[PDB]
Amino acid sequence: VHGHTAEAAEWYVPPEEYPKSGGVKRYLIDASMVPLSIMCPSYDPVEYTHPSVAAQPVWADPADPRKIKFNVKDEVNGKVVDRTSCHPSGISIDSNTGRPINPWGRTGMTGRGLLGKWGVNQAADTVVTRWKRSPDGSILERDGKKVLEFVAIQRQDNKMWAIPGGFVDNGEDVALTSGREFMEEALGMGTDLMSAESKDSLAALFSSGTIVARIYCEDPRNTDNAWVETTCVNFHDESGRHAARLKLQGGDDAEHARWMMVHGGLNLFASHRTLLQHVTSALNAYF
Amino acid sequence: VAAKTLLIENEDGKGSTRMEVQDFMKRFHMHASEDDKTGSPSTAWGTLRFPTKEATAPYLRLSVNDDPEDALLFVKAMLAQKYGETYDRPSLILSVTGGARNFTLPPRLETAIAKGLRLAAQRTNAWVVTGGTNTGVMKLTGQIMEALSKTQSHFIPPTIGIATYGVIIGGDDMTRGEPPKIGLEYEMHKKDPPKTTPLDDNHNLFLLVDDGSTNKFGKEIKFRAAFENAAGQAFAAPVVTIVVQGGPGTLGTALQAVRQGTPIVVVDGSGLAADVLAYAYNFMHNPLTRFKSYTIDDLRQKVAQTFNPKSSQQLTNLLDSALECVQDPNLVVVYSLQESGIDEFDDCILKAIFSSQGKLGNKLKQAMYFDQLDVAKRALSEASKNGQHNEIAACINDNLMAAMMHNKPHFVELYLGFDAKIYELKPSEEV
Amino acid sequence: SKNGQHNEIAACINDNLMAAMMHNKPHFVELYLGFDAKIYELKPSEEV
Amino acid sequence: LTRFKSYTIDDLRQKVAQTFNPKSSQQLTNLLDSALECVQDPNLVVVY
Amino acid sequence: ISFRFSLDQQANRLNSAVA
Ligand SMILES: Nc1ncnc2c1ncn2[C@@H]1O[C@H](COP(=O)(O)OP(=O)(O)OC[C@H]2O[C@@H](O)[C@H](O)[C@@H]2O)[C@@H](O)[C@H]1O
Ligand SMILES: Nc1ncnc2c1ncn2[C@@H]1O[C@H](COP(=O)(O)OP(=O)(O)OC[C@H]2O[C@@H](O)[C@H](O)[C@@H]2O)[C@@H](O)[C@H]1O
Ligand SMILES: [Ca+2]
Ligand SMILES: [Ca+2]
């Protein structure tokens, strides 16, 4: 039918202008030259580090990446940080500067940029789902499969809808980080609002979670020396009773939060469509 | 004889002060060219006389940067001038949007839309806001309201037309001179290069939004949305958008309307963008079985066959915008002939009104206007069961007062049955 | 009418209305006249 | 009947807590236990 | 409605309660 289709070049290329950098632009490269196996000698990336990262906060690694061990759990200030990538080959260390090189391809820009940690920045995303139901109580069905529905927040920086989530703090696990970000962003808890049972309902909601995927993010802040990799945690409400007690109200770095149907035409931040695909694949839902 | 002084309503909303026309008109600017930003004061304001129309229609050319409250003050001031101070205030705003180009609708559907709009407009004394151009569905809406001008005596509800000034024939003729242009003959067949869009002769007012550009469309959408919201807040009246057919710009106006909280009523079966928004409402929410085979791929093909985008990214953006519009099920009401019925369009309008921001007294008042006792009793019963008795008691007196005034005895009996003391009535004004 | 075949309706509505008048079917006459058939556009079968 | 198929003891416990407001958890437990022990025999309760 | 309902219910573990 299509002739010279030539497979499907699915490769991700980040946008030219780096977000919140004041107009600093990367070195452009077409999508057919990205993988690290091909040589590509005409490669001149730009070294850029954000002033916030360069001011040295608690969540930022030191500017000299020497003596740091990757691919294993490393202790920084007595707190454990993961540093292992989901890529089968692993992370290879450049001999000249000691900085890690991104195994998922070139992005045309070195340095850390907006990311505080060298190498793998582990992020946790929380997909809280429920079946999309009509008033009468019957679950809506499209393409012979039952339709899911997830909580989505509108991001502060670019005003495009996304899955709630954030970077894992030092000395903490994916479980607390996922739960803490969901209360902070989707419910605005803390920065005592809801009390007693509602918390108990939420606890019931949080007692059954499944890690559905651990993938590489197509995040525009990714560089050649710092990239985001996500662990996705799905909280599914089969009955829908616990999900109905959630009073959605945008807080912290989220403007608005709402329940949104899952389909293939969704325009979300980074590779969250792939994450939603994994959630619907696991639950045999429509996508 | 041209008017020299006008009664402009104060910002407090308690009375009208008499002020000179030139002293108020100065706040309005017009742009001679695209380069100009500050502008010069508008000399294009007055009345246009149209062939075969008995009444004359006011027109005002105003800038994009002009305050919509000032334009709202202008429409209130004209209404106050023409019909006296105690004119019938609108309790409902009906925005009619859709296709600019000519189209043919089925006779049953055309009869149903005409009957429902006429019924809604005549029962609520509604302000109908259209595009104001002499083409397609807006012109058709004008024809519908033309019949209102034949079937009704004394007060005629205004038909405000908001159009871009840069595409209107005779803008140069309108600008030149010393205004007001009392009874200016409008020549719709005259060729003013490079423009081809005439004003509709059945519209009762005109707002020509100017930005200095020429032959660029869609520049008046944001101002139109802002004016409707300002009017809605000022008269404490719900704004209901009506979507019949439509092109690419109909999606953007509907997008602005939903984002600002205004409900929309999409007329299914009229073709084009209305079919798209309906397919979307059925795909996302309808629990019925016919709509179980609906898929986004078939929706994408329907969008491609109707609007025909040049690039795939444009279609992706257009779908994304269309799917983002029907996210909230309350704000979209789809009217279809094969499911609802021919005489059910006003119910759909009332359903859109009830789906809006909670103001029970206003919703009961609109329900009293449409003579739907079952909707009002069900709303009151649901409020009664859910412990919202205080809100019932706070609004029951004003609803009972309104029910007595507009001769609805069944609503009077209902409200009196729902614990409304007869002696606690209060006058609207102060004696 | 629903499937966008309005042109075929308009092309045959006059002859159907003419036939309906001839064979004394008033309900069909009312239907065809309700479906956008102009009364003055009738044409004779033969040539005068 | 089907509407009452989504009813659970947890939601019943929350309803008891929101209406009577006990000081201690043991008091609520005793109050529910007493309430559930009262409707044990279906003949003796008629709900209007 | 009862058949439809009897029909609706007929069709790495992580604990995040610490948050
Ligand atoms: N390692 C880090 N890198 C960058 N920022 C960090 C880091 N650690 C803490 N921060 C702080 O957290 C803020 C980032 O916002 P969060 O809400 O923590 O996370 P956010 O970026 O909003 O969400 C991350 C999202 O990106 C996707 O790749 C991933 O799936 C996740 O959903 C930054 O302003 C920064 O101050
Ligand atoms: N308000 C207008 N009046 C007349 N012609 C117009 C208008 N807007 C655009 N046109 C031109 O007429 C052509 C037909 O337009 P359609 O696609 O049929 O309709 P659409 O472009 O969606 O018009 C939307 C406009 O109409 C109003 O109902 C609504 O308020 C919106 O401003 C378009 O190619 C356009 O160039
Ligand atoms: Ca976040
Ligand atoms: Ca956060």
Q: Which chain E residue is nearest to residue A209, measuring alpha carbons? A: E14
Q: Which of residues 205-224 of A touch B (CB under 8 A)?
A: none
| Helix or strand holding residue A203 (H, E) | helix A197-205
Question: In sequence order, what E strands does B215-338 have?
Answer: 239-244, 264-267, 332-335
Angle made by CA atoms A260, A262, A267, in degrees to the nearest 5: 80
Angle made by CA atoms B43, B48, B52, in degrees to the nearest 5: 170
Q: Which of residues 192-211 of A touch E (CB under 8 A)?
A: 203, 206-207, 209-211
A and E interact (at least 3 Cβ pairs within 8 A): yes
Of B278, B338, B334, the closest CA to residue B303 belongs to B278
Structure tokens at A183: 């209360």
CA A155 to ligand 4 center in whole angstroms:
10
Q: How many angstroms separate the CA of residue E1 from the nearest CA in chain A?
A: 9
What is the C-alpha to C-alpha distance for residues B203 and B206, in angstroms, rounded to an integer? Answer: 7
Question: Which residues hold their Cβ within 5 A of ligand 4, which is an ion?
Answer: A 166
Q: How many angstroms separate the CA of residue A134 from the nearest CA in chain D?
A: 14
The DSSP symbol for A136 reads T
What is the C-alpha to C-alpha distance for residues B176 and C6, in angstroms, rounded to an integer? Answer: 47
Q: Which amino acid is at A101?
A: I
| Residue B33: count of CB within 10 angstroms of its CB | 9
Residue ranges of the binding site of A for Mg(2+): 165, 181, 184-185, 252-253
Is the Cβ–Cβ distance between A206 and E17 less than 8 Å?
Answer: yes
Is the Cβ–Cβ distance between B222 and B76 less than 8 Å?
Answer: no
Structure tokens at B45: 């304001």
- Give a three-class secondary structure readout of B229-262: HHHHHHHCCCEEEEEECCCHHHHHHHHHHHHCCC
CA B200 to ligand 2 center in whole angstroms:
14
What is the C-alpha to C-alpha distance for residues B192 and B174, in angstroms, rounded to an integer? Answer: 12
| Residue B383: count of CB within 10 angstroms of its CB | 17
Q: Is the CB of A228 under 6 A from ligand 1?
A: yes
User: How many Cα atoms are found within 13 Å in the side-chain-facing hemisphere of B62?
Assistant: 26
Q: Is the CB of A157 under 6 A from ligand 1?
A: no
| Residue D48: count of CB within 10 angstroms of its CB | 2
- Partners of E1 on chain D (C-beta within 8 Å) are 2
Q: List % helix, strand, coil for chain A (3-state, nearest 5).
A: 15, 30, 60
Do B106 and C34 lie within an 8 Å CB cutoff? no
Q: How many angstroms separate the CA of residue A138 from the nearest CA in chain B?
A: 8
Question: In sequence order, what E strands does chain A have?
Answer: 46-49, 74-76, 79-81, 92-93, 100-101, 109-113, 119-131, 141-142, 145-146, 148-155, 161-162, 165-167, 209-216, 226-237, 254-261
User: How many Cα atoms are found within 13 Å in the side-chain-facing hemisphere of A19?
Assistant: 14
Give chains near D: 3+ CB pairs under 8 A. Answer: A, E
Q: Is the CB of A164 under 6 A from ligand 1?
A: no
Ligand 1 closest atom vs CA A125: 32
Q: Which chain D residue is nearest to residue E1, measuring alpha carbons? A: D2
CA B346 to ligand 3 center in whole angstroms:
44
| Residue B209: count of CB within 10 angstroms of its CB | 22
Give the bridge partners for A225, in sequence order. none
- Partners of A241 on chain D (C-beta within 8 Å) are 6, 8, 11
Q: How many angstroms separate the CA of residue A142 from the nearest CA in chain B?
A: 5
Is the Cβ–Cβ distance between A225 and A112 less than 8 Å?
Answer: yes
Angle made by CA atoms A201, A205, A210, in degrees to the nearest 5: 170
Which of A136, A258, A264 lies at the smallest CB-CB distance from B296? A264
- Partners of A197 on chain D (C-beta within 8 Å) are 14, 17
Q: Which chain B residue is nearest to residue A136, measuring alpha carbons? A: B287
> SS3 for B51?
coil
The reply to whether omega before C26 is within 30° of 0 (cis) is no
**Which residue's CA lies nearest to atom 25 of ligand 1?**
A166
Q: What is the resolution of this structure in A?
A: 2.9
Rg, Å, chain D Cα set: 12
Residue C38, burial from CB neighbour count under 10 angstroms (0-12, 13-18, 19+): exposed
Give the bridge partners for A69, in sequence order. none
Residues with CB under 6 A from ligand 2: B 97-101, 131, 133, 135, 138, 197, 217, 221, 246-250, 253
What is the C-alpha to C-alpha distance for residues A259 and A254, in angstroms, rounded to an integer? Answer: 14
Q: Which chain D residue is nearest to residue E2, measuring alpha carbons? A: D2
Of B11, B61, B73, the closest CA to residue B172 belongs to B61
Rg, Å, chain E Cα set: 16
